Amino acid sequence: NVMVEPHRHEGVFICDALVTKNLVPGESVYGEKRVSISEGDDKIEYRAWNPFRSKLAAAILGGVDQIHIKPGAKVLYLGAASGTTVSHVSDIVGPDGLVYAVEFSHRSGRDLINLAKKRTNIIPVIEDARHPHKYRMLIAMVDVIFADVAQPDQTRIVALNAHTFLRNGGHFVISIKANCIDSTASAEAVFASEVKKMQQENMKPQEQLTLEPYERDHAVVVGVYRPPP
Ligand SMILES: Nc1cc(C(F)(F)F)ncn1
């Protein structure tokens, strides 16, 4: 009996629990449950991915079509916090991928640094994502921008990072908590307005979804960056 099944998204798996393949067998990051399966001399460990903590896990369980975070991908993660979701992104992209974890809080940054000691594919970048000129010499061009900065001007922030770091034809995945953008607008008005602003930065949404029952008035938007020459 095969207990843990590959999900439609490469590097993701189902166990109905979402899990990723643990890049650091034997270690939990935030108290999550681990599942190690041995058979003969073979062994593989997975980590449970809580959708009540991780917007990306909520989006995957909600039926998002693409996440673009895949094995081998180079990912610029804006708003990395203490590394909860980043750790699963690191699992997904694997040893040949890369995750830049941009977080401006020094306190959260210390959690990220501890997380990255074990994970060679995480680069902690403890900086303000509004000023990418300060860290641009550390960031090789990436395949995907994941953004969870929860700021009214986050589309402008993400776009500024896209213009500096995101390859033509690469993709973005943006988490949008509506009342962190404008708490006096409806969720629909916020999401419409952010989608519109993205299109004007040549960030073209390809799908969008909300995250009930895990989060209220919280969207994830996925799309493709198609900048001019
Ligand atoms: N959580 C965050 C927020 C930001 C910001 F808004 F300051 F640019 N930069 C990095 N991490």
UniProtKB/Swiss-Prot annotation:
It is an enzyme of class 2 (transferase). Its EC number is 2.1.1.-. Changing K33R: Decreased acetylation; restores ability to methylate histone H2A. The modification Phosphoserine is found at S28, S36, S38. Residues 186-218 are annotated as: Helical. GO terms for molecular function: ATPase binding; histone H2AQ104 methyltransferase activity; RNA binding; rRNA methyltransferase activity; TFIID-class transcription factor complex binding; U6 snRNA 2'-O-ribose methyltransferase activity. S-adenosyl-L-methionine binds at T84, T85, E103, F104, D128, A129, D148, V149, A150, Q151. GO terms for biological process: box C/D sno(s)RNA 3'-end processing; osteoblast differentiation; ribosomal small subunit biogenesis; rRNA methylation; rRNA processing; snoRNA localization. Keywords: Acetylation, Isopeptide bond, Methylation, Methyltransferase, Nucleus, Phosphoprotein, Ribonucleoprotein, RNA-binding, rRNA processing, S-adenosyl-L-methionine, Transferase, Ubl conjugation. It comes from the Eukaryota. It catalyses: L-glutaminyl-[histone H2A] + S-adenosyl-L-methionine = N(5)-methyl-L-glutaminyl-[histone H2A] + S-adenosyl-L-homocysteine + H(+); a ribonucleotide in rRNA + S-adenosyl-L-methionine = a 2'-O-methylribonucleotide in rRNA + S-adenosyl-L-homocysteine + H(+); a ribonucleotide in U6 snRNA + S-adenosyl-L-methionine = a 2'-O-methylribonucleotide in U6 snRNA + S-adenosyl-L-homocysteine + H(+). Ubiquitinated. Ubiquitination leads to proteasomal degradation. Deubiquitinated by USP36. There is a cross-link at K21, K43, K55, K70 (Glycyl lysine isopeptide (Lys-Gly) (interchain with G-Cter in SUMO2)). The modification N6-acetyllysine is found at K33, K117, K118. GO terms for cellular component: box C/D methylation guide snoRNP complex; Cajal body; extracellular exosome; fibrillar center; granular component; membrane; nucleolus; nucleoplasm. It is found in: Nucleus, Nucleolus; Nucleus, Nucleoplasm. Its main location: nucleus. Belongs to the methyltransferase superfamily. Fibrillarin family. S-adenosyl-L-methionine-dependent methyltransferase that has the ability to methylate both RNAs and proteins. Involved in pre-rRNA processing by catalyzing the site-specific 2'-hydroxyl methylation of ribose moieties in pre-ribosomal RNA. Site specificity is provided by a guide RNA that base pairs with the substrate. Methylation occurs at a characteristic distance from the sequence involved in base pairing with the guide RNA. Probably catalyzes 2'-O-methylation of U6 snRNAs in box C/D RNP complexes. U6 snRNA 2'-O-methylation is required for mRNA splicing fidelity. Component of box C/D small nucleolar ribonucleoprotein (snoRNP) particles that contain SNU13, FBL, NOP5 and NOP56, plus a guide RNA. It is associated with the U3, U8, U13, X and Y small nuclear RNAs. Component of several ribosomal and nucleolar protein complexes. Part of the small subunit (SSU) processome, composed of more than 70 proteins and the RNA chaperone small nucleolar RNA (snoRNA) U3. Interacts with PRMT5 and UTP20. Interacts with DDX5 and C1QBP. Interacts with NOL11. Interacts with PIH1D1. Interacts with RRP1B. Interacts with NOLC1. Interacts with SDE2. Interacts with NOP2 and NOP56. This is rRNA 2'-O-methyltransferase fibrillarin. The lineage of its organism: Eukaryota, Metazoa, Chordata, Craniata, Vertebrata. The chain holds residues 85 to 317 of 321 of the full protein.
